[model samples]
Target: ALMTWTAAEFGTNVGFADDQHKTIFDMVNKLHDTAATGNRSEIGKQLDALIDYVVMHFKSEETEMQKKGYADFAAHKAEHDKLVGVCADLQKKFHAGEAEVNQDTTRFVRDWLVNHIPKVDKLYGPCLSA
Candidate 1:
């Protein structure tokens, strides 16, 4: 099931930023659906695409924060780094057949993402796009 376009109170005013959030939401939903469908290889593909774009999106967002003189850039960057690291580990272990894309994993991915974009990521919104 696709989530509707969301607008948190802390959401960015920038069009591009909001669009990025929408894209992420859709991707997360896709991953969840893929998991429910019970295809390991397809789950791997969806997961890979999701994380790959997450890394790219983080870089784009970090640049925005930097250019806008956001004082919390370091902490924000740390969050992005932690997620990327965790995703990388998941990908590695899953490929090695040591990990399973179960409820806990999918829910964590969905929750981590749905919360982060609107909560933590949006925390930077007001300070940006000057």
Candidate 2:
């Protein structure tokens, strides 16, 4: 099953932003699938891909926010940075065999995607509309 937001639902009404959001959604789904399969090697690969994609996505959004003069840009970027740090720590643990591929991480992935899109992402939606 697909996650909460699909491409069609990404009606940010801004072309670039909507497209970026769709890409983020796709990456999140890929990460979830990798987590579900219980293959450490595959999970490692997918996790790397997801992290790279997320960093790119955040940069894209941050650029958009800056171009649009969004006032909350710094705070939003800080949130993204914090998440990146957490993910990096998790990735390091996984690589060192200190972390096991499990449902908790998958659940964290799902919850972060679901909540952040509407709350954090939506903060810039109004600015993009103008």
Candidate 3:
């Protein structure tokens, strides 16, 4: 089954940031569905798409942080990097057949989305434009 989060519940209020959040949500849902079906090829494709979109989203936020000279930009970026690294490691395991696409990864993605949006993403939203 696909996981979902409504737009209003998303903590990042910045227009662009919220849009990116939605994209991530959608991609995660797709990933969950693919994983559940045991569609290995599709899972790989979706993972690539999700990773690319996430990287772009992070770059956009990083750019905004740089432009605004946000005090915690470096810390925020480090968080982004860590999440990206985790996804990369998961992908590696999946490709090597050492990991099955399971509820744990799905749960991690959903939890990160819910928690990080409200905390990390919201922290930068106020600094950026409304």
Candidate 4:
């Protein structure tokens, strides 16, 4: 999947968050295609990569929000927590063999990024870079 996170679709001049979001998007799509290979272990590795980047992105956004004393920091962080928790749950499931990484899992993760950002993030986007 040649998925590119465009500013027009992402709804930011840059979102300062675009590149990282694109990274996650790419990872998810990569895993989406990777999953079809039946390499469960490789899929797990990709999942881990996705989770790691999500953590990084969430932390970056959270720190910026807190530093700026943004009123919605708590709310924003909660949303982040939701997905992070979901990812943790998914990660555990993958390792436990309760769930195999597949297109659905990949879609869920990517959807979280594209879905959450435009809806709530744009409201807080200005607290970051030019």
Clashes of 2: 0
Q: Per-residue lDDT for 1-130 in model 3, tens only?
A: 4656666677566889988888888888888877777777888888889888998999999999988998899999998999999988988898898987765777798887788778788888778964
Question: TM-score, each model?
Answer: 0.87, 0.84, 0.90, 0.90
Model 1 lDDT per residue over 1-130, tens place = 6455656442577667787777877887888788877788999888888888888889998998888889889898998899899989998999999987755666786667667776677677668755
Give the residue spans of candidate 3 off by over 4 A: none
Which residue pairs show collisions in model 4? none
Backbone clashes (count) for model 1: 0
What's the lDDT for residue 1 in model 2? 39
| Sort by TM-score, top down from the best | 4, 3, 1, 2
Score candidate 4 by lDDT.
0.80
RMSD of every prediction: 1.9, 2.2, 1.6, 1.7
Decoy 2 TM-score against native: 0.84
Tens digit per residue, CA lDDT, model 4, 36-65: 888888888888987898899889888988
Best by lDDT: 3
**Deviation from native of the Cα of residue 14 in model 1, angstroms:** 2.5
* Residue ranges of candidate 1 with Cα displaced over 4 Å: none
Candidate 2 vs candidate 4, lDDT winner? 4
Better of 1 and 3 by TM-score: 3
Model 4: what TM-score? 0.90
